[model samples]
Target: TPTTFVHLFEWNWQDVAQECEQYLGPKGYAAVQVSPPNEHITGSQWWTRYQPVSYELQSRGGNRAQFIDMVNRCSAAGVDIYVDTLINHMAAGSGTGTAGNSFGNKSFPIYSPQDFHESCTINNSDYGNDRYRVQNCELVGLADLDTASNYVQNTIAAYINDLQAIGVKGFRFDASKHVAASDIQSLMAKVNGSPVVFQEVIDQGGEAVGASEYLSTGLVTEFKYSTELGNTFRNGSLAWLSNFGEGWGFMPSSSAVVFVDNHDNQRGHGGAGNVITFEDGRLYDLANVFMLAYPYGYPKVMSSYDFHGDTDAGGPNVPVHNNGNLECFASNWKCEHRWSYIAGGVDFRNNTADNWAVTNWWDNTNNQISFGRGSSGHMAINKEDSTLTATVQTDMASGQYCNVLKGELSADAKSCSGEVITVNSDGTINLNIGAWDAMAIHKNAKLN
Candidate 1:
């Protein structure tokens, strides 16, 4: 039951297939939240994908044939696909889409102007004050779908069902708050199978349309969780993370879809706050590993491409050269998912699934922190400038265990490539975590 979801933002079909077979499937990642597979505007801007033109399943990510091949290959590799859907809105204005599809404000094969809301921009002044205005108006000029229309709801449901027929197991509803909860629930009813649904309801407190409103339908994106965790891991002490959930205004774990950074937030769009990204280097990796080990919500990892000049720049449309290692092949790709620390954390999370409660908590009242999960796993993170030497309660039997954060477990799981730790008879282990480094020991990664 691997539960980690990686957002492979803007990755093409062939690349996704390779990553699924070579990395994700072997590392215990459950699924990939892919970019919108539908036809969209023709541009190098990333938001173009969001402004979809049709449900043609042909876009910069891949064409119909490649998309089908990817689904089959990835599914065979034991990884499921959860698409980022665009049912809330269509393209804002007139344009020829990436797949040679033509569209205008009043024109589409599946929808017409009457199927859209009135062309009024969402009143930002009423964002936290009015739910009707937020849900009924255009978001950044994007034409809001009149979800109340039976025709519109059925059309959107048909599009989703099409993807489900293509082996998609779930969806990440983009801009879901803009649509009424009743509309979303109705759309869900039209879906054939019980696909997992998580809506992007940016409920950062005081929002008129709260995430709780959509919890009855599915999990809502917990942006507040990212903001709080990013702030604590950067400015505040890691000790604060001990009481992370509901205390910090986050939705309940069962109804929360969590991530360190998403496509919108990574580029300063859609209410981006103090969120952390790959640019933070070791600090970012530390926060992601902590997210996996801490187990507060359904965690999603952001896999991005390098961007410059324009924040909305899209990933390369063609195959770029890889660096030979199992990392991102192209220079523009910031495949954070392949980072050893973060990728290894996926295994740590899968191995420590049963160890949910924070059994042994130790912090230096500063940047250093250590904790253990019920007799199954122990992790130490050091963000200070120097090494930290301390005795940690591992809560496991005395044995030789591999430091999984910095090492590889052999095929037979009998040896390790990096340093090892010995848990004493007292269930305590003396450890020295280096500056900007972390150490993790799990029951399944024991050397002997």
Candidate 2:
């Protein structure tokens, strides 16, 4: 059973489906959360997907036909497709869509001016007391759909309904904080399946819209998880993460959709934080490595493209050709999800499924921590300025195991492509974790 997922943001359907079949599925990934598929404002900037013009399912990600095949193909490969959809409709005023539609088109509805809320702007200056101003007003220039209207709610459902029929298991409600919780349920009532609706509500204890409002309707993006975890991994201590979930005054583990860095916050598109990103190199990998191994929220790994300095730049026109190596599709694309340690973390998690509680917790009272996952998996992190060499206790049996953080276990299980660790007969292993790095070993990688 799959657990952790990856967001291949801005990845087209062909590559997405291909990755599912060739990489994700075989690699034990749960899902590929994709960019919004609806027809959007024609532009080179990636944010264009958020300003949708229609629910026609025709946009940069792919057309309806390609998306259809992608869902079917990816599902058959044992991976699920989770879509990003805008509950808030098109950008206000006239902006031609990627499909060249003027305003918008069923499951693509041609939204007239009457289909939207009355022209009103959100008072960013002060929205603490008057949540109505935050929910009803336009999110900047994007026209807020009149979800209070039955027609509007059902119309958006049709788009979700259509995708659900195509085998999509979940949908991320982009700009969901702007939509009222009641309106969210109203639209979901018309949907066929009880699809996983993870709403993007950036509630950091002070927002007008609270994360608790969306819990009954669907999971909410726990921004506190990302913000706090990022701050700790960046400046605080890894030892602080031992008691990290609900105890930290964040959302409960059950409803949290956590991440190292999502597409928006990384680019300063509002959900900003002191997050560790691809720019930090292996330190970023170590952050996600901790997230995946820790028993907290459902983690989503972020796959990215290098924008250099300009974050708003559009997708590359060049094809993503890979030869199973970094240089295969190098430089421009920063495929963080496929990073060696990240992938190994996924394997460590999948191999230790059903073992949720953390055990054998060991920490240096500072920047180092090592813990076991219900006797099945063990991981250690050394984020200090110097190498960590110490004996760590475990619940695992005596044997040599592959250090998945550095590499993977070979196909035959006869060799580790990375570093190896020996578990003494007494269920203990020595860790020589390097500074700003980590190591993960699972029972599945045990050698004779």
Candidate 3:
């Protein structure tokens, strides 16, 4: 199985399917977290995908046929689809949905007004002290569903079931912090196949409802990971990241869904403030290279559109691809996942998936650092303004290895299309990483 995956945020079904086959699968992505695939209120904003209108597989992501086609195609490519489900709330205003389902106020086609909780905004101050308000009240005036009700649970379950039957094998339960653990459990119980489940719980330190509260379901998003990782790469020292995971007070590695940034946090919507995005240039690339190379939570590489601070806007009408890379600048789609270093991190993660320990740790006690994933992989990153030059120690046998960050691994996997380094018999290689750059090597890149 592939290790790291990418979040093709706000991408249409056609583009997503094309990506899975042409790019994602070939690059070793295990899965993709797509925006909500259900029917939603018509809008030009990206958040419209989060507002549910009906369970029908129709919206800006394309209709049912496109979704099925995308799913089957992606599955054939060894990539699974994880839907971003909006079950905590329904569409905010009254109108017809993309599937042509008409709704009035809080009254959805499949739900009566009684199916919803009495309206109340999730107050800014309510998250930490008022757990009841954070969970019970509506999030920004969106119609909060009575998730405790049998009708709501079955309805949401059926929606998931519908997607699963269409060949989707995973789900990202959005607004999961607002829904109770037991309610989510009940909904999961109603699901047919135990699809890969990950809850979006934005818990940063002292919040009343946080990461620990949602472990009963499956993987929980570690918002602190992004905040801390971003701070280290953006303003702090890379050496501090030597002990970056659980010791830093994040959730257990196995049950955590981590990322450099997401569609929400990147746009200042959900996990804001402590994030590094595509706008950060080389810094963002270095940050993600570290993320994919590190031994931590399931890392999601962000494949985003250049929303240009206009967070509410949707994606370009069509994503253009050439020579295996998204012509993101022209199409306004930033495919950070396709960048050399980040994609190489995926192959490194997969080849080292079984080797869970962070071995051969080395740092200059400043902005330059290097580490090994057990004996499966080794990487060095230079965050300083000056060039990084050193003789790095490794655990692998003596051989010529490809530097994945610098170039591509050839199709036959026999040689690298990038710079190759020859490790000595004592397992050491001379390293000269550039300023704000990175280099990574794994057993898969080794040639005897």
Candidate 4:
């Protein structure tokens, strides 16, 4: 089965549990990447969560009990929890944290000035050229941890080991590029089991700390996927996506973790660049659906709350509805995973797994492109202002299939709520894709 992961962003532990049971598990999602659960600087701004004050596992996400409960519950639901680990640094300033832990930039209970690199701001020019500075200097004025120090490494390892004991299946190392590659490997060496790891090394070429540096450890975030897909889709480069992958300068599928937009890029932080987010509306959804349908890097979907104008805004202020269900919609959340097309994309991905070749290709000179996933599925996307009408070849057997993007599949899996497409015996189908719209049908979605 094709696997899918979701970055739940800043959701609390209890809400995450509720989501896993009600949405993720049922929808065939493989895992959920949660926000940093470690104790962080107390603040209303979301970046504060990246500012770790302690390893208490007590913060805006919930206390230790809630986190442990969330892990156990999500595990039971067959949805693993991957934490956003902020081990590269501590809080950049003095402050009492969410867990009432007192901390300072150079003075914490367990971390002293000796545990951090000498205070020095990193220059932009050094990013693409200098490895030592990139690994040792501070990022965005945040204190840089001396990851080489045995004491600091041991402390971070102990925290990760504790999380392992609590059943965390993996980790998304925050600002991993700031730490030396050797240090990261050393830290991983201390992890008891070989936990799934994906380091956040934003290498947009010319970076001394490149994503390739961490591939041996685990998957590295392919920021290039987001940028390339976003720019291509926005600029009507649909046909080129037919050959998406290493041809487009992306890391190999096995070594990369791909997403349309992460929590950071969606809000224009954490080295944010040209990327698409939920705010882009249908185009954003189209990019994500394409990512799911295309056989490339491992795909991770981003679910976020509406931040409106404030990029650094905190998450929704909804109180947890512990009545044995999720209440995200009632709280101004932008649950992109719940969207009709995206949810169907997850189903499409799972149904079309192992079919890597693009077949039955058809495209207009401008922006419309249609292709089949071997015999498992087919899709058409139109980007021009005018509606597209064409006869496209599909590899799936002749049948009336539901266009999952436009509607829903009946619970019985035998009927549909939207457009039903009929493929002729010759493997051809009449396609009508609207401007900035898409049509997708898969083998598992056939109607009798």
Per-residue lDDT over 54-115 for candidate 3, one digit per residue giving the tens place of the 0 to 100 score: 88888897888998999999999889998888869998878889999999878888999999
lDDT of 4: 0.84
Encode model 4's per-residue lDDT on 1-448: one tens digit a residue: 6388988878899888988898899889999999899888888998899988889988999999999999999999999999999867888879898888787648887788888999887898889788888888888778889998888888998998899988999998988888878888888887888998899988889877788888788889998888888888876468778678898788998888999998777776644445788777888878877898888878889888878778888987774344644445443577888888888888888888868777878777658888889899998888888888889888889988999887867878788999998899999988777788888889888886
Total clashing pairs for each candidate: 2, 1, 0, 0
- The estimated TM-scores of all candidates read 0.96, 0.95, 0.96, 0.95
Q: List the residue pairs that clash in candidate 2.
A: 105-108
Q: Give Cα distance to truth, residue 385, candidate 2, Å.
A: 2.3
For candidate 1, report its TM-score: 0.96
- CA lDDT of 238 in candidate 4? 84
Badly placed stretches (over 4 Å) of model 2 are 104-109, 271-273, 322-329
TM-score of 3: 0.96
Model 2 lDDT on a 0 to 1 scale: 0.83
lDDT of 3: 0.85
User: How do the residues 1-448 of candidate 1 rate in per-residue lDDT, one tens digit apiece?
Assistant: 5879899988888889888898889888999998999999898888889998888989988899999898899999999999999878898889988889788965876788999888787887768888888988888888888999999988888988988898998898989889899998888888897899999988777888888999998888998888888888878988777778877768898788898888888778754456898888898889988998887889999988878646867785445335554446245777888788887787788898986788788988888898888788888899888888888887888998888777877988788988897889999988788898998888988875
lDDT (Cα, tens digit) per residue for candidate 2, span 228-295: 88899878988888899899998888899999899888887655547878888878888888998998
